[PDB]
Every structure is written in C-alpha cells, then in structure tokens.
Amino acid sequence: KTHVQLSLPVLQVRDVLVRGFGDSVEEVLSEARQHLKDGTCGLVEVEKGVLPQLEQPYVFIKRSDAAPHGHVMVELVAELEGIQYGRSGETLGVLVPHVGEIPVAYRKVLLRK
C-alpha cells in the first residue's frame, strides 16, 4: 500500500532520549521510515525552542492534502542548515526515535511510504 495508517506517540522534547535519526538527509529519511514501519517512531510538536533542543538533520511530517478515518495525510520532509528536501504542507511535528518515553497524546496520520 502507498499509505499506512499510524498512531504516533507525541513526546515532550525534554523527555526525548535519542534526539535525531542520524547524520545526513538521506540517512534520517531512511531511519525515519524504518522506525515508522517498526512502530518505534515518536512525534514532537514544534514550538519556540524545540528544534534547537533536537539534532539536525530534522525529519518533519507535513500535511500532504486537506483526512481518511480521522488520519491526516502526511509525507516526510528533511531539513539541514535551513534547506528542505521535499516540498509539502504545514508541519504536524518533528519525528524522533521512540525508546519508551511516555507520550502526552497520539497523532493519527496516514503516511505516504
């Protein structure tokens, strides 16, 4: 399937133990996709002061369309040194590894793979 229904745990930035997916735009998109398949991916909502507390390159989920079965359609966009790789809608958050942090909420998404 081109799209997968996922419920992503929303993490507080100060709880996140692993603050990125790796060291290059291609690696972080690769690892983000692997973690999303393995159910080991979290979401941090972007507010003032969040991104400087995480590791570049960043992987965003961005709205790809205006929401089947309550799931917002999203795609991945990476960012390094102020350049984005991908073009998409509003950010829903920044993806990070999930290693057992307690979430504050769940975000239902339909992920384009």
Ligand SMILES: Brc1ccc(-c2nnn[nH]2)cc1
């Ligand atoms: Br991104 C992403 C998310 C899930 C999957 C997947 N493959 N099989 N089941 N789920 C692949 C890529």
